[PDB]
Write a protein that binds this ligand. Sequence first.
Ligand SMILES: *[C@@H]1O[C@H](CO)[C@@H](O)[C@H](O)[C@H]1NC(C)=O
Ligand SMILES: *[C@@H]1O[C@H](CO)[C@@H](O)[C@H](O)[C@H]1NC(C)=O
Ligand SMILES: *[C@@H]1O[C@H](CO)[C@@H](O)[C@H](O)[C@H]1NC(C)=O
Ligand SMILES: *[C@@H]1O[C@H](CO)[C@@H](O)[C@H](O)[C@H]1NC(C)=O
Ligand SMILES: *[C@@H]1O[C@H](CO)[C@@H](O)[C@H](O)[C@H]1NC(C)=O
Ligand SMILES: *[C@@H]1O[C@H](CO)[C@@H](O)[C@H](O)[C@H]1NC(C)=O
Ligand SMILES: *[C@@H]1O[C@H](CO)[C@@H](O)[C@H](O)[C@H]1NC(C)=O
Ligand SMILES: *[C@@H]1O[C@H](CO)[C@@H](O)[C@H](O)[C@H]1NC(C)=O
Lengths: 719, 719, 122
Amino acid sequence: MRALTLKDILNGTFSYKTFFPNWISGQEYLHQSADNNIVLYNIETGQSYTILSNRTMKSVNASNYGLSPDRQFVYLESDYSKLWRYSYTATYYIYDLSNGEFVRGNELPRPIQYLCWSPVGSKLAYVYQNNIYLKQRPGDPPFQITFNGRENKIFNGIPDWVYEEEMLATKYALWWSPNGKFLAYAEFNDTDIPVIAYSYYGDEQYPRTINIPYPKAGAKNPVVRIFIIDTTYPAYVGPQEVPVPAMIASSDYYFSWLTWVTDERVCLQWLKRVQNVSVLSICDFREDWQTWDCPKTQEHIEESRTGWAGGFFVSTPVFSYDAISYYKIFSDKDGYKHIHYIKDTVENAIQITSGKWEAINIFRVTQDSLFYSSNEFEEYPGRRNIYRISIGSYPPSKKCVTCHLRKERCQYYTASFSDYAKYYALVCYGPGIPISTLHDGRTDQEIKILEENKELENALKNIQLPKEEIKKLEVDEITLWYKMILPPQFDRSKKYPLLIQVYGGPCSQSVRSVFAVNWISYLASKEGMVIALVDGRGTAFQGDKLLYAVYRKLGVYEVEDQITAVRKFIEMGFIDEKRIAIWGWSYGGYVSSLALASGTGLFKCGIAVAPVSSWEYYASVYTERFMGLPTKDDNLEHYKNSTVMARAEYFRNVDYLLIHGTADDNVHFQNSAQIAKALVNAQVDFQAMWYSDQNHGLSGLSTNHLYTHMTHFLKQCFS
Amino acid sequence: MRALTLKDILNGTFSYKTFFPNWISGQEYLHQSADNNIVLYNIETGQSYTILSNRTMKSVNASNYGLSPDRQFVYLESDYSKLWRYSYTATYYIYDLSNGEFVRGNELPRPIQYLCWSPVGSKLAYVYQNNIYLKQRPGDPPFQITFNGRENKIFNGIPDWVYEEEMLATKYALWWSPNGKFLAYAEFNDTDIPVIAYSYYGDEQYPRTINIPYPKAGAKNPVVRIFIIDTTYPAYVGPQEVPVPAMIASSDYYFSWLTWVTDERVCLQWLKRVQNVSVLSICDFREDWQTWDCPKTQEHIEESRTGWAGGFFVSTPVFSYDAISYYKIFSDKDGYKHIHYIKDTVENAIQITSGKWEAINIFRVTQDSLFYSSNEFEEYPGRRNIYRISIGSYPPSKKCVTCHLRKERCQYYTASFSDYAKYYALVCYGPGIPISTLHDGRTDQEIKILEENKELENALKNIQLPKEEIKKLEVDEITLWYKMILPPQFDRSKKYPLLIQVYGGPCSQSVRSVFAVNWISYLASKEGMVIALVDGRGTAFQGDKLLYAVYRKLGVYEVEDQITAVRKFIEMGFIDEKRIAIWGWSYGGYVSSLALASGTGLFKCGIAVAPVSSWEYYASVYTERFMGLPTKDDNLEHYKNSTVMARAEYFRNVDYLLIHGTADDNVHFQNSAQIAKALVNAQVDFQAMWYSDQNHGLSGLSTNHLYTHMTHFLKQCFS
Amino acid sequence: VQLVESGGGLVQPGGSLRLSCAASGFTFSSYAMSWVRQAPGKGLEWVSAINSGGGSTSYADSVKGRFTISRDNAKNTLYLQMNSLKPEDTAVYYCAKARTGWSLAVPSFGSWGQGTQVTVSS
Ligand SMILES: *[C@@H]1O[C@H](CO)[C@@H](O)[C@H](O)[C@H]1NC(C)=O
Ligand SMILES: *[C@@H]1O[C@H](CO)[C@@H](O)[C@H](O)[C@H]1NC(C)=O
Ligand SMILES: *[C@@H]1O[C@H](CO)[C@@H](O)[C@H](O)[C@H]1NC(C)=O
Ligand SMILES: *[C@@H]1O[C@H](CO)[C@@H](O)[C@H](O)[C@H]1NC(C)=O
Ligand SMILES: *[C@@H]1O[C@H](CO)[C@@H](O)[C@H](O)[C@H]1NC(C)=O
Ligand SMILES: *[C@@H]1O[C@H](CO)[C@@H](O)[C@H](O)[C@H]1NC(C)=O
Ligand SMILES: *[C@@H]1O[C@H](CO)[C@@H](O)[C@H](O)[C@H]1NC(C)=O
Ligand SMILES: *[C@@H]1O[C@H](CO)[C@@H](O)[C@H](O)[C@H]1NC(C)=O
């Protein structure tokens, strides 16, 4: 009956909820009720009790909890303080459940960077001031494991900036043995890395300076080492360092991943600095010298001839029940990523899945079944469906679990499994209203609906939402997949303005079957615009030919794909050719700026939010993966032809809006400053805006200001 | 006939030329013609000849010259490199005139921060890496005087940032005696001073950090000492330190000025950190101990009961022919600055000038005459005229030499005198086309016209220029002086938009009879607007009451004066009430922001270029001169209740444009950063623009960009 | 005016010495006396001064606590004793007569003799 408004988007009055159970055993899980009570649910009996009441949580002003494997102690977390995208610090209290009071022995230090229980028992391991401490029981003084931890120079048990952001994507680097017998950790050395410095104004008379060790393209890199320590007698021999393969240690290298197989067997995954070679090694524990041995025969090599290794990240193996074979997802002979089963030798691997589609994730491998995700159903790249196959059975079997559950409401799924895969939970994100359900692990039948978002569906009855469609085009040989958002009461006999939203990043996808009510929804519903998203070369989940096309050629084919899509949309017949605009964010800004200044006379206006101006200003791990080294012998020529500044002359007959935050640690303010300098030196008019003491996310009231300003700009352009 | 264009202003086309003779004797002067030739002109004989050809200047790419008083050596300067408003470094070569070849054997190092000849003879004193070196002859090894000079910590012979910008307004802090047998210098210690740091981007992978010692309001201050050394035998006893008066050396104090009386008599001026009291001391040379003595009977005290001491700076004395008495300008019993004659004691001073006007400057005191400037003529406080008074003559006399030379063309004069005041030169800046003339010096008779600016007059014949008037208003027993610029073909029966340009700074004046063709001239000529400038209380050259009305209350009365003037202009009857704007620069940014957010509904849009946000962010000297200490005991309340941010809520229904440069050292970027943060936190829409690596002046193409952007903004508001 | 200096020579660092100055022509015990030194490649440097009566003495900052100056008007002699020498005082020493006997007064550039050479080295 009524259209959307900007305040309905800025204030999240249309948002959904999801249910991810916190599994603690094969049949029970934990949840936080509305009244902040920690409730334990048992599926087999259907009985619930309050492990922790809200009074205890409010006593110490706690906001998060963690339960010990033996159900005898609970740690409560307070004083949250975000540092980077994934890392933060807090204060931890320990509460006893047997007697019902906080322990008052050796109190924990403050603040603490990371804390973890043991998989069994009640051992504790935490990180404080870049050092690792271990306590055998809640009430016992700690044992210090590392001593050389220094601020901003040496990290023990936690990653530095570049590893946290570009390689691990976690806040921790330390792993327990499956039975809590050994502990493995990583040490990062950052002594020789250059430092980026920027200014923080705050609320004092003098501004202060913030320094971060940040390796840009073709600079020095951190040094990583891996140690394993016995957790029952951690003074007999001390930490032991695992060996590095000979073919890897010949030059610079990275540490990709670690996985525990058994108490006496671990798996490590390394990647070369030239990032098109990766090595997987398996190391055993020998008791004669109480050390770790990695034989040569247990090394597996993966290389790519036409691109980098893996996708955005290198794939992780999932080990079998008998723990000498595994399953891994990588490219096949036809250029599509599929599942292979490896027992003794890589070249003897057996392909399990095949076709003109791709397999995305492996969830769980039990003694008889394997669960995974795919986009095979109906040849739609942008859908996720859960499939289950049988292993070790005389007749082969294959079942699609979710493709016919709710066909018109759910085509994008994720799964969470319990211990021994007795039960699992399915979460559906779109294209309808999200919904979370619980399923039995043997017959795959629904037994309970965890969440179905009734209040949102009731509240959305009086709101007219725009119409969304997903389609494809073929031009000469490339297939472009596009999503179109059309206003209500759309008529093909009239003409409408057009807005393009672009990200275009490598190993990424922007045309998905998800549900969202966001800024472009309001733009289509109230301002009567038409919004388009396009996916072409460089995007993932469509084969290796399409993915590896933009290799050492960043910022060339994305613009061509966008322009071709725009021309086809104009040829459709309901688009006004004088009112076309484009916008993006953080490689959306890069492509948006390069497309606006392409000299085609197609776009009237464009917006760039925190864009990248040159590839010499960004981090080494990301850039060198897709562009190579910026040396005269390798790729220096293209590092200079692919900058926004070099096109500064072509911004004459277009409208530009440049936005950036001065305290951005990921995409530094240097890029926007250089763009502005180049635009001024060429005598070109444009508009700008800066946000003080704001990071890459622009969280808070800055989001309101930014979206209001962009709405004003777009409304002025299309008048 | 055609109107002005923006490109005419931006590429300076209508710019005048002046002629300041470079006096080298009582009857000769040097000039550089439009051929890079250095020509010596003799007035008595009337002949002239070249002393340095352009070939020699081009041989070393020189751009400036300096001739020794012996006329035997010249120094040529190249490799100019600006650092601050006044300071710079360069490379100096020495040319021998007798032999016509460069001096070889001991070349000066590079870069050199300051260099000066002696008044008599040819011996040099220069500053290299914050140390003073003396050369007896241009072909001799240097003699080092100071040894503790360190970069950014200790300064010898040159001022630091604070003294260069706020106190001395020069680039040097060393003085020769009249016959060049003593050298006096000052040493500045900056070690406990806090440091301001900002980011410089440049052209490199990583930006760098610039650090400057900068005392904000209420912080620690530099420490200054004064030394005098014998230049004939500098190794005998070394430098000697000048004593400080007991009443001054009880707290923090400043150093105002130094002036030589004779070869054995020097004068110094000191200021307390509380600027209410100033002390003048005269020191003599004792030969029995080779030292300096400052008797207590030779101290003169100047204090102000209602405000600071002096105007923007403290006045300097001009000594008579007997070197025991002097003339000085300060306020009399009626609050008007006039000339007084001091022989023995301050209370015995004799008033030379009196009336309801003010004396601005003292130019020369010869054996029987005194030359000065005043605005006595016709009671216009915006004019400058030159008067001559007879001293020591049996009948008193007084004449005005400039008020009837060219009555309708010239009413703003300055003078330059030769040795013994044999001849002088008058430069006229407006309100007509500027002129430069040489006069007799004994009968004040014209001799020749140095500069007439005929080409500019020929170029301005086919151009319509706006009409300018200067008038006054009498509101609430307060007289405001305003200057109004009107478009050609002005009609009183129509309505026009209005723009206000405001500076409003203390001890300043904006309504002057000065010729200029600038941005507002183009705005009035082509865009058909009416411009106005208003001078109210807090300004100078009108009395002590008007000047000191704003003591310890900054930002209160200027806004009231501007609003009252705007209301009177509206009452005049030819102003559109719905189109009024205001703008300023670095103190008019402050006043513009405060007036726009006054909640009166008068202004439609405003512009603030590099404004001051809070007085806690500016330099200690300037801020504490007019406001006082920012402590709870003295003036913290008005420090808190005067910021722009506190009015952030009142920007809701106006248009705001904020401009600042990121590499500003005078008014730091943090002011605009805090303004933007405060505006964002209150959900108020505005516009902004920054200039990368640009100083306070915005020199280069940044000026073109800034003025084009402001023109676009103003044209949009008044549409 | 006639003045003769005696003493000095070549001595190892850390030693001690003393030298004498004898004056004639003018009237002694009526003017202040002073000791000055000249280093190779440097200018004249004032070292010490002694009053006309012998009550108060003045020393430079470079030889403070190491030099002792005395006078005897009966023999018209001036004595300067150096102790704890350092390898930078190698210079030629001159005896200077002031022009003010009313009180202490450093002679500026009055009479100069030949001086005595003192060299210290290992
Ligand atoms: C803001 O959103 C909240 C839910 O997050 C909702 O309760 C409330 O109605 C909304 N308020 C407005 C003014 O839209
Ligand atoms: C805590 O939980 C109890 C049990 O449901 C409830 O009665 C009470 O309202 C809650 N108190 C809060 C949420 O402050
Ligand atoms: C870190 O590296 C630096 C130099 O790269 C080296 O001096 C230092 O020993 C290393 N720190 C360790 C290994 O803890
Ligand atoms: C990619 O790996 C191949 C071997 O598979 C190697 O020849 C080549 O050097 C690597 N790529 C680059 C750019 O070095
Ligand atoms: C720029 O100004 C210069 C200086 O007078 C003048 O010679 C030239 O004509 C102007 N150039 C234009 C107006 O294009
Ligand atoms: C140098 O000055 C001479 C003087 O006549 C003149 O002829 C010549 O043009 C000038 N050369 C330059 C390059 O200005
Ligand atoms: C400068 O000041 C510092 C302390 O403020 C002091 O240590 C140092 O001696 C001073 N330097 C000189 C040359 O007096
Ligand atoms: C100057 O100001 C100070 C502090 O405000 C005050 O104590 C003193 O009386 C004033 N000096 C005068 C008025 O001479």
